Design an enzyme around this catalytic site. Sequence first.
Site, PDB file in Angstrom:
ATOM      1  N   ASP A  43      42.708   2.192 -38.643  1.00  0.00           N
ATOM      2  CA  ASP A  43      42.585   1.831 -37.281  1.00  0.00           C
ATOM      3  C   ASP A  43      42.307   2.165 -36.038  1.00  0.00           C
ATOM      4  OD1 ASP A  43      41.572  -1.492 -35.427  1.00  0.00           O
ATOM      5  OD2 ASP A  43      43.345  -0.574 -34.350  1.00  0.00           O
ATOM      6  N   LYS A  77      37.159   1.266 -31.480  1.00  0.00           N
ATOM      7  CA  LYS A  77      37.201   0.662 -30.233  1.00  0.00           C
ATOM      8  C   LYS A  77      36.970   0.830 -29.075  1.00  0.00           C
ATOM      9  CE  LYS A  77      40.775  -1.664 -32.255  1.00  0.00           C
ATOM     10  NZ  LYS A  77      42.084  -1.092 -32.262  1.00  0.00           N
TER      11      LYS A  77
END
EC number: 1.1.1.21
Length: 312
Positions: A43, A77
């Site tokens: 992530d 992101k």
Amino acid sequence: ASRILLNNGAKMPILGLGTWKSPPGQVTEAVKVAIDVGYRHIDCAHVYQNENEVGVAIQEKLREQVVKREELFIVSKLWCTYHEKGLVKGACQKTLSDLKLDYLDLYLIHWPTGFKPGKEFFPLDESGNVVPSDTNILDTWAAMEELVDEGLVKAIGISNFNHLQVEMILNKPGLKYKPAVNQIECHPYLTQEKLIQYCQSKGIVVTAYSPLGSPDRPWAKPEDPSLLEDPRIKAIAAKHNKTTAQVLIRFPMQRNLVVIPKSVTPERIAENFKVFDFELSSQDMTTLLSYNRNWRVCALLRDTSHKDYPFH
Ligand SMILES: NC(=O)c1ccc[n+]([C@@H]2O[C@H](COP(=O)([O-])OP(=O)(O)OC[C@H]3O[C@@H](n4cnc5c(N)ncnc54)[C@H](OP(=O)(O)O)[C@@H]3O)[C@@H](O)[C@H]2O)c1
Ligand SMILES: O=C(O)Cc1nn(Cc2nc3cc(C(F)(F)F)ccc3s2)c(=O)c2ccccc12
């Protein structure tokens, strides 16, 4: 099972390594260790300011043939200052360049709130208010859909979106790709039952961030509730001859969530992965759920006027 099926046809490892707050000088080795130990999901985010260093680790382990790119599940992101239609692809490409990849497995809108574009991550006015951008999430979403159609990312999703905001995406006129994932804060003091049921019912996979309560967040206070030191959770762990972190990771896994604990500590990176050899009981699960306090660890700007603040 180690992976969950997304609504794009791909499988996502339910265990990943978080990288927020992982120092630039430590995270390369942390990710190399994580891959040696078996993690396949990392992530990331541009705003974490360590994507270059993460990418070094990925490249070395691909080189060493410890892993193949197809076995990796790499998530990043889109930061708030890039919600503008014309900035989204550039943002993605920068992330791709730093990670040294030619695609992302998943790219998320990091936060529903758009901010003024510029060098600053949190642009403020003279009074300390964050300066918003006038772009709405639905045009941002169209721009995320283009990235799929251009081959830059295999899946797109959202993060820190509330029920109403997810619903707006789902009801977007001309919606082309549904979000695959909503990545939200989730742990026994913030169980989010309603939001998770709503997303799961729509075929949206939920990822649980800050599953250990983010004890290293910069704004923590000594006084704060501590999941890791909750004696009740301690008790359950001991019953299963596991550590409290292992219980805290296993817990969202059994709720059919993806979970992404962060560590730069090699022993903890290994410990955190050893969660596929035990089961919490339904009762353990309900008991863990009973600890909900609606206590949110990760959210600043709580007094913001931003129209898309997700946590009222
Ligand atoms: N979408 C977003 O807005 C958002 C927001 C927050 C987080 N996230 C993502 O979710 C990831 C995880 O959340 P988080 O970083 O906030 O915190 P977290 O994973 O809940 O907790 C991290 C803290 O736990 C410690 N730790 C890890 N394993 C441990 C173990 N087995 N025993 C004891 N302590 C342990 C770590 O220390 P060491 O590292 O020193 O070992 C670090 O201080 C992030 O890194 C990021 O990737 C996304
Ligand atoms: O983002 C991460 O993954 C972790 C994260 N969380 N936070 C707390 C936040 N609180 C917010 C509140 C809003 C708001 F909705 F209010 F506008 C918008 C955006 C944010 S970020 C941060 O300030 C932060 C700063 C640098 C890198 C990572 C983070």
